[PDB]
Ligand binder design. Structure first.
Ligand SMILES: [Ca+2]
Ligand SMILES: [Ca+2]
Length: 180
């Protein structure tokens, strides 16, 4: 239904952000390119960087790939598995999406002040291959928190990945059509 058609569009858009190497699959080269450029661009040294790399890779294997999952994920396979999950238990699906973005936004939280500064936010996109800096910054401005968007803005990506309502004012859906 239309609930699903609007959601399918957001899920496909979210797939293109995750596919860092624009090859139509989610694979280990995506995990490696994103984690390597995240640590390098935060001026991290070898130990703290590898610890950040373990954290990034655990996020991918838990919330994207899934245990007992395929080695590579197409967009079709990605939307098929998210659709099946939403149809079987929506409440559980929302919780998993909450748990997902809670994990990643803590990685993005580099100073650990439990908020997402402008610098932390532009760099996760830059690490994930997205260099539209005026569009990331205008995206940041939409949340009226100039010096710090609190990490309970995973509720924005919860809306983006779980809401079935085409009427929502979704700043994530709006700005990712500009950044990527
Ligand atoms: Ca890829
Ligand atoms: Ca921070």
């Amino acid at each position: 239904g239309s609930h699903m058609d609007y959601l399918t569009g957001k899920w496909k858009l979210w797939y293109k952000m995750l596919d860092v190497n624009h090859d139509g699959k989610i694979s280990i080269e995506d995990v490696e390119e994103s984690r390597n450029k995240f640590t390098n661009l935060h001026e991290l040294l070898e130990e703290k960087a590898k610890g950040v790399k373990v954290d990034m890779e655990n996020w991918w294997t838990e919330y994207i790939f899934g245990q007992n999952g395929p080695k590579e994920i197409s967009e079709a396979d990605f939307v098929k598995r998210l659709q099946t999950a939403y149809e079987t238990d929506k409440a559980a699906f929302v919780k998993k999406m909450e748990n997902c973005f809670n994990t990643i936004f803590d990685v993005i939280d580099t100073n650990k002040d439990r908020q997402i500064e402008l610098d932390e936010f532009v760099l996760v996109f830059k690490a994930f291959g997205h260099e539209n800096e005026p569009a990331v910054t205008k995206f940041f401005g939409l949340y009226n928190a100039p010096a710090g968007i609190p990490i309970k803005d995973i509720v924005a990506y919860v809306k983006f990945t779980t809401s079935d309502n085409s009427n929502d004012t979704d700043y994530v859906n709006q700005s990712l059509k500009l950044v990527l």
